Amino acid sequence: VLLLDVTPLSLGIETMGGVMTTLIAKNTTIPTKHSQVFSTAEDNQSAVSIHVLQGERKRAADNKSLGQFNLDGINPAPRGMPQIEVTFDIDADGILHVSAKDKNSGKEQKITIKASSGLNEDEIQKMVRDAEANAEADRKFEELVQTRNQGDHLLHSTRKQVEEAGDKLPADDKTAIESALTALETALKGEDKAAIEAKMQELAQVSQKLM
Amino acid sequence: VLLLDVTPLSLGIETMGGVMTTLIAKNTTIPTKHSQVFSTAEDNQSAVSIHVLQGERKRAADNKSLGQFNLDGINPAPRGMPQIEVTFDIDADGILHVSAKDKNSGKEQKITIKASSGLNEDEIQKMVRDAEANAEADRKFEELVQTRNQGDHLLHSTRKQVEEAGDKLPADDKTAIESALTALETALKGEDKAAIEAKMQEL
């Protein structure tokens, strides 16, 4: 009623794209706990790295790293299928408890970050300003990463789809494809939304005799 | 320099989950244009409905519907593979131009919404207030749909994975599967994150 202990900045984890997923948003009254289920990015991925972050930017790189830990032993699976739950938990003492647990194999790793951790009152104001200063440039990163990640999904979708009808695929179609796949994956490594969508498009015109 | 034309509320399209994806964020100085590439949700999906919305909520249902249009002729494809680009364009006149174009088949539909369209100044403040009044309940919806959508992805991943090894899958494994899949999908129709993550776990 007279005071509320609250989170100064958002707390989340870095996910695919180099982006950062917020689990406890800014100015949340701390005693709170949020969990969200994630998955793997690669086929047969055995471990996930839980990179903890405090910040308001879209680049996990432009935020404060409170810690990082690995949850391994994830039994081999088709990408996007394993289930990993990341649970951010801050008690009244303002102590953060980040746990990751394979919602199947039961494995669970943890890390406890004390409240003295993070950006100080100063860094907190700078974080907030830059967030506002860069809001648009951050908006550019979002749309890029979303696309980039969708370009990823296309590269693999198509790569596997090749197998599902290998010889059914006529030379200069199947060859016209592998070439574009090689071109796109490179575009993904870059950051030109336009060109990424461009190679995505090329693959979409070449890889048609199996649409 | 003295005054600025800004969009009073965010503009976007409704997507899988019943959620709403913002293409032009709130208070953007209008002469702006943004485009984001979307795809289909189902296998062999032939058309997408571009449902235009204005609002700040997470539920496409809790926003102002500016209009809707269909972009069909999407050549059959595995879900998540067709490329559809939605482009929101608001000129100085404040007129909205929402187009969608199959980044492969070339097709493209368009809709033009005039500036008098939308929530008036009154509705704009109520929108903004409810946004804030509900901010958390909205957050509940966000985490719900992300999980729900991920449960959708599993239901299919699994269902197809069955074919990829049909006979390879011994009865009471393969039967044990077909059963829970039925369970999960029902849960997805629900809105209990705890329950959905459970039926997901079961599979």
Binding site: S39, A41, R79, I84 | -
Partner: peptide, 4 residues
Amino acid sequence: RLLL
């Protein structure tokens, strides 16, 4: 949302 995938992780590495």
